[PDB]
Design an enzyme around this catalytic site. Structure first.
Site, PDB file in Angstrom:
ATOM      1  N   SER C 199      29.902  47.631  49.356  1.00 53.99           N
ATOM      2  CA  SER C 199      29.347  48.953  49.085  1.00 53.99           C
ATOM      3  C   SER C 199      28.413  49.368  50.234  1.00 53.99           C
ATOM      4  CB  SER C 199      28.593  48.909  47.746  1.00 53.99           C
ATOM      5  OG  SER C 199      28.387  50.196  47.194  1.00 53.99           O
ATOM      6  N   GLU C 324      38.265  51.922  42.733  1.00 59.20           N
ATOM      7  CA  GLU C 324      36.925  52.145  43.279  1.00 59.20           C
ATOM      8  C   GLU C 324      36.116  53.250  42.598  1.00 59.20           C
ATOM      9  OE1 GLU C 324      35.370  50.298  45.580  1.00 59.20           O
ATOM     10  OE2 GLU C 324      36.757  49.670  47.141  1.00 59.20           O
ATOM     11  N   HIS C 437      34.511  49.175  41.103  1.00 55.88           N
ATOM     12  CA  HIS C 437      33.682  48.963  42.285  1.00 55.88           C
ATOM     13  C   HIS C 437      32.778  47.732  42.138  1.00 55.88           C
ATOM     14  CE1 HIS C 437      31.994  50.438  46.042  1.00 55.88           C
ATOM     15  NE2 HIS C 437      30.767  50.402  45.548  1.00 55.88           N
TER      16      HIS C 437
END
Ligand SMILES: *[C@@H]1O[C@H](CO[C@@H]2O[C@@H](C)[C@@H](O)[C@@H](O)[C@@H]2O)[C@@H](O[C@@H]2O[C@H](CO)[C@@H](O)[C@H](O)[C@H]2NC(C)=O)[C@H](O)[C@H]1NC(C)=O
Ligand SMILES: *[C@@H]1O[C@H](CO[C@@H]2O[C@@H](C)[C@@H](O)[C@@H](O)[C@@H]2O)[C@@H](O[C@@H]2O[C@H](CO)[C@@H](O)[C@H](O)[C@H]2NC(C)=O)[C@H](O)[C@H]1NC(C)=O
Ligand SMILES: *[C@H]1O[C@H](CO)[C@@H](O)[C@H](O)[C@H]1NC(C)=O
Ligand SMILES: *[C@H]1O[C@H](CO)[C@@H](O)[C@H](O)[C@H]1NC(C)=O
Lengths: 61, 531, 531, 61
Positions: C199, C324, C437
């Site tokens: 991330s 995601e 995610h």
């Protein structure tokens, strides 16, 4: 030379042009519709494109 | 030979019987339905053919309406099979009737054919439109008529009386009216007339659907590879007179009356000589003179009508061919030709998007390029070739048709959709073009049954299978068997069902190029409007 | 316990050995690498930790950098496993080292971890980032460090010396420098440092790749579900100070110097209280204070750099997870939640395109809607839900990554791509979100080997399989076996090859969301620019 | 009533609000990050949305 000949309203046929060149009159921009072929090399214009030839024989196709 | 003599409101006619691998058929060719649009009449709506004394010879086809002869590929078949095959003349408003033998005892449904040709060409006497087999197999009545084209049929000076425009559509209509008072003489049923046409002919069909006065002249419609709402099917009053004035200028003319009067003084071929000049440059699948939205024949744009209209009590059969676009690309799209496999380069492709999508902004083009590009194979010549083919095909045929279809079905009509995806084995066009525009016609008319031709045994069966669909639709307003054979469902705006028409059996499918057409019909409009 | 005593340039440290189903590992937690950024130091680049007398206790993790605590779903696991799990403090610049046992005899490759958290949250002490297993299995050295976040890490007044910005990235760097002079004490090889992050951590990795001064601090990079070129990864100087000034205003402040001085006088929690206010409204996957393009740390936007840069002599491993986007939708997207199946309605979907695609024109949105809509199922709640998920996912992660990857590979680097598509069996998030995610992390660190946890036998093997890839990349700059096992090919701008990472074996695939990303990276830009 | 309680920097815990109502302070527009819960019904603002409750018990979630 043995070239094509016709108008906007006749079907293309063979013709003997001889020592003169031949031509292919079409619309310059698309649709590039063929408007006529024959003997000689005549002037074109903004809307008229003319392509000439000699050697090939039946080349103005 | 007693059935070859028939009398219509105009007078006596003498026809000919035509041979068929299944039996003879009575045909009457060249029946005059309008007073020839010569000189003073040129550009004016047609006037009914006046009664005649004696018997008129209706054994051979009549003159093809004056038009341009497509000479792109001298001596080529895929190009010449569409050119005039009879002497050209402004005296060309005639029609033809094909009726069973012996002549039906009870009123039998009628099929009226309107040919294609981009409103600039065409003739009812083309071999591929011979109705003998269709009439012989399904025992129905078949009528086809010639209608003015090019300037003679559509040059328009919106508002004027000398050159009102859409007179070509008026010819078609006068012929449909002729069918109402006379088809019964040949055993035809005027209470059951089904119109079917291809390309511009389909567009025409659609316009008769959208024109009140034509409504009492038929009961069913078939639109093949064309719709009245295509970007080529019509032009606005503005552009209409811009083009009409340009033609006059190029021709030495000169006040509307003055312009037209002069125009009437020029030789037919002189007008045809400058027909293509007036076309707002660079494009493919665009024609100079076409139907005009003037408020008369069409009170509003076809799109406007197709959304506001109530289509209850109407059955419509619509469809396209596997590769509608291919054909037109060889008329300007860089790198395209029938002589090789047109494996274009990414460069040519991008330039071709502009020819295949006329008068559109640079951002609009990029929008086209984005959707029709395989970003996993951005440069593949093979895919780029089929992409520019779809681009033109979707834009000019599939999506206009898909929208009309959904609006019709959704607003009270019975619609049946189809995708002709079988390449004729006699196709003279290169293999890369697939099943090109106007190549489903030869089968609908059952030309494969003709011995002098070399179609396959399966294709003769196929042709028969197709004719039944058409004939069934004409009779009942429904294609399938009036069975235990695969069923053809109605096209709904919801499921969007249609069937493939090839040698294999009917296969039902959903979505008619749905994803692509969303671009053309929904998004693109907003994009253009916003810029 | 003789290996638990180590000396670094600063002084003596006393660690602890950690138990593992395979053997003990020596860990040193909470090594101070910078002087605490308290009061006068708040907002300023970090200063090296001064030498200390005596031995420092490095047995337990240190404080988590002051941050907002995500309390969306009180008591929920998928949400709390990411919150600070140690007391918060501005005194938080510490780092951790995990080295094999016994301590390696020869210099062994190092892996430095930078955590995610949108630049507003995160900590090296989170359970899911425990490096004991990774170090124990692949026998490598592992270092992870805490770096300032939120205003404390990124509030910026571009140009000023009091609050220059990107100090968070400067913390990361100071830690990497600490690794250069000290990792050898733990048997680590400073000539073989590989950065890996997820991330915002991946974004950071990317920025160190694009920042000259950081270049001599590592040799390889791994970007997991993130890139420096994402629309959330950075903000411009303009917006940067617009936000910084807004925070000051909301907080009673007040001249840059004056603003900051005042800002330094406010309690840490008071600043965190107003952190989210400064966000230019309505969006998801957007954070208040992030890295700034000021010309210093980054001489130009990441995009600019990624295209002009020469990446020869560099190996990079990049990748994303199956879904995601899903995760972020429950933070604002109408109709979305973890408590049901978010079967949104076409209405909600269309409204959601605007939240998932911030600051964009109405025409731009319609452009999104067009592409992400199944026009054969325009209303299907199931598909609309996965569509808005892809929208956010592609826009914020997949496409930025896909572009960086292609530009890198194309400009001299060795790139390997992957798509983690295996849902952890312990996932507390609803089944509809798929593989969300940041959920590939628990496996990369080999958390499934931990007994106290309930993973499947196959997942423990999987975790091992993954760690080898990572470790192999660290050692050689190449994932696969340094075999007769399926081979993982380099991601090229051409073929665009990547592999799926699930229980099944490596499967190679082309195109990384190619069709969609063409919209985001190629067309959309032109569309916006033209309006 | 048994409701939640916390700040921007503390984890949510249960608390007994009693006869007072409870609240849920969040960011008004997305991201709608939760900023705090507790007892009472305090004013919000352009950026602060406050949702109150009573009956449910642990309702300010
Ligand atoms: C495929 O054919 C097209 C068009 O036909 C060619 O061009 C004619 C003038 C003649 O040379 C034919 O024998 C060819 O088959 C080709 O496109 C033309 O290419 C020439 C280059 O020699 C170029 O000057 C013209 O402008 C092109 N015409 C256009 C506008 O498309 C094309 O190169 C051929 N591709 C293959 C497979 O070789
Ligand atoms: C799925 O959940 C969403 C959000 O959670 C719901 O709303 C909470 C306030 C609470 O009632 C939970 O128990 C629900 O699960 C639902 O969306 C909300 O719906 C309500 C209507 O009752 C509406 O007033 C809110 O504004 C909505 N919140 C937003 C912005 O999404 C949604 O209706 C649920 N769908 C299903 C499957 O029932
Ligand atoms: C059959 O006739 C077709 C014309 O329709 C012709 O093209 C074909 O070559 C013929 N087959 C032969 C050679 O007998
Ligand atoms: C195993 O431990 C997990 C916590 O990691 C827990 O969720 C699960 O229920 C446990 N299994 C049981 C009930 O023994």
């Amino acid at each position: 030379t043995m070239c094509y000949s016709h108008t906007t309203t006749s079907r293309a046929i063979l013709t003997n042009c001889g020592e003169n060149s031949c031509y292919r009159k079409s619309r310059r921009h698309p649709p590039k519709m063929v408007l006529g072929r024959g003997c000689g090399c005549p002037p074109g214009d903004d809307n008229l494109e003319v392509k000439c030839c000699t050697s090939p024989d039946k080349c103005n196709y | 030979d007693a059935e070859l003599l028939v009398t219509v409101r105009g007078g006596r006619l003498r026809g000919i019987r035509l041979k068929t691998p299944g039996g003879p058929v009575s045909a009457f060719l060249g029946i005059p339905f309008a007073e020839p649009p010569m000189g003073p009449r040129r550009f004016l709506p047609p006037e009914p053919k006046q009664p005649w004394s004696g018997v008129v010879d209706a054994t051979t086809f009549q003159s093809v309406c004056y038009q341009y002869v497509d000479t792109l590929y001298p001596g080529f078949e895929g190009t010449e099979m569409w050119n005039p095959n009879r002497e050209l003349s402004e005296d060309c408003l005639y029609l033809n009737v094909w009726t069973p033998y012996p002549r039906p005892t009870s009123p039998t449904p009628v099929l009226v054919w309107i040919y294609g040709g981009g409103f600039y060409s065409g003739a009812s006497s083309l071999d591929v439109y011979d109705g003998r087999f269709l009439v012989q197999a399904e025992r129905t009545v078949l009528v086809s008529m010639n209608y003015r084209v090019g300037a003679f049929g559509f040059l328009a000076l919106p508002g004027s009386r000398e050159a009102p425009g859409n007179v070509g559509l008026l010819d078609q209509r006068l012929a449909l009216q002729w069918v109402q008072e006379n088809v019964a003489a040949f055993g035809g049923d005027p209470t059951s007339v089904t119109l079917f046409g291809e390309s511009a002919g389909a567009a025409s069909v659609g316009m008769h659907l959208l024109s009140p006065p034509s409504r009492g002249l038929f009961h069913r419609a078939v639109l093949q590879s064309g719709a009245p709402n295509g970007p080529w099917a019509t032009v606005g009053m503005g552009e209409a007179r811009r083009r009409a004035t340009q033609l006059a200028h190029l021709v030495g003319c000169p006040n509307d009356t003055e312009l037209v009067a002069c125009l009437r003084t020029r030789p037919a071929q002189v007008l045809v000589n400058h027909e293509w000049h007036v076309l707002p440059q660079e494009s493919v699948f665009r024609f100079s003179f076409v139907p005009v939205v003037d408020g008369d024949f069409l009170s509003d744009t076809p799109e406007a009508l197709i959304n506001a209209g109530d289509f209850h009590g109407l059955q419509v059969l619509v469809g396209v061919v596997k590769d509608e676009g291919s054909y037109f690309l060889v008329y300007g799209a860089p790198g395209f030709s029938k002589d090789n496999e047109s494996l274009i380069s990414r460069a040519e492709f991008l330039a071709g998007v502009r020819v295949g999508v006329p008068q559109v902004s640079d951002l609009a083009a990029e929008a086209v390029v984005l959707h029709y590009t395989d970003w996993l194979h951005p440069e593949d010549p093979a895919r780029l070739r089929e992409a520019l083919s779809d681009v033109v095909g979707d834009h000019n045929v599939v999506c206009p048709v898909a929208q009309l279809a959904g609006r019709l079905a959704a607003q009270g009509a019975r619609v049946y959709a189809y995708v002709f995806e079988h390449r004729a084995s006699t196709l003279s066009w290169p293999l890369w073009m697939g099943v090109p525009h106007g190549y489903e016609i030869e089968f609908i008319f059952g030309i494969p049954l003709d011995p002098s031709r070399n179609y396959t045994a399966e294709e003769k069966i196929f042709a028969q299978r197709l004719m039944r669909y058409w004939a069934n639709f004409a009779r009942t307003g429904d294609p399938n068997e009036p069975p235990k054979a695969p069923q053809w469902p109605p096209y709904t705006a919801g499921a969007q069902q249609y069937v493939s028409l090839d040698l294999r059996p009917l296969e039902v499918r959903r979505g008619l190029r749905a994803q692509a057409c969303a671009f053309w019909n929904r998004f693109l409009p907003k994009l253009l409007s916003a810029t």
